[PDB]
Amino acid sequence: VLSGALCFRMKDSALKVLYLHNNQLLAGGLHAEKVIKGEEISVVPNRALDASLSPVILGVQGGSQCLSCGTEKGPILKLEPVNIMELYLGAKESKSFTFYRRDMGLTSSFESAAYPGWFLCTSPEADQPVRLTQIPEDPAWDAPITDFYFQQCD
């Protein structure tokens, strides 16, 4: 087993780096990038789910908090005060804390395992929270961005 979670750096396809502010993950513009450092994203595979779907659990602050979609009838992206290693080692499904990664080459998309059809996304605007969205039939320049550069820290 991992002695610590994997370390990744994330930014959307528009190169907006994800950072933390007031307990929320935001995607910053070039200006924000000069003030705050991108957040090191903790990552662990969710071994309770189908490996062919690339299930992962994402966390922040050294893995002290993890991204969750909640358990309501509708998805709500929020950081929860649970250590990613607790989820990693626990014999518990933890589906609401899981995303299915779709590797498209240079970038990846992340679909909520608990809420099919909902994907992690960023706004075309800078410094807005990362959220969840369903994919529109027709693309647009002002539509949410669901593709991310998912790179392991050096």
Q: What is the DSSP string of the chain?
A: --SS-EEEEEEETT--BEEEETTEEEE--HHHHTTSPPPPEEEEE-TTS-GGG-EEEEEETTTTEEEE--SSSS---EEES--HHHHHHSSS--GGGEEEEEE-SS-EEEEESSSTT-EEEB-SSSSEE-EEEPPPSS--TTSPB--EEEEE--
**Residue 54 sits in a domain of what CATH number?**
2.80.10.50
Under a CB-based contact definition with an 8 Å cutoff, are residues 11 and 30 in contact? no
Distance CA 135, CA 145 (A): 10
Residue with tokens 């099919």: 116
In single-letter form, the type of residue at position 102 comes to R
Classify the C-alpha dihedral 153-147-62-45 as positive or negative: negative
Deposited experimental method: X-ray
Q: Residue 100: which of 42, 58, 149, 153 has the closest Cα?
A: 58
**Domain range spanning residue 44?**
1-154
Question: Quick one: resolution in A?
Answer: 1.6
For residue 87, what are the CA distances in angstroms to 47, 72, 90?
10, 20, 5
Q: Residue 18: which of 60, 76, 81, 66 has the closest Cα?
A: 60
> For residue 63, what are its two tokens?
């893995």
**Number of domains making up the chain:** 1
Phi, psi of 89 (to 5 degrees): -85, -20
| b/e 100-118 (16+ beta carbons within 10 angstroms → b) | bbeeeeebbbbbbbbbeeb
Under a CB-based contact definition with an 8 Å cutoff, are residues 110 and 145 in contact? no
Distance CA 143, CA 77 (A): 18
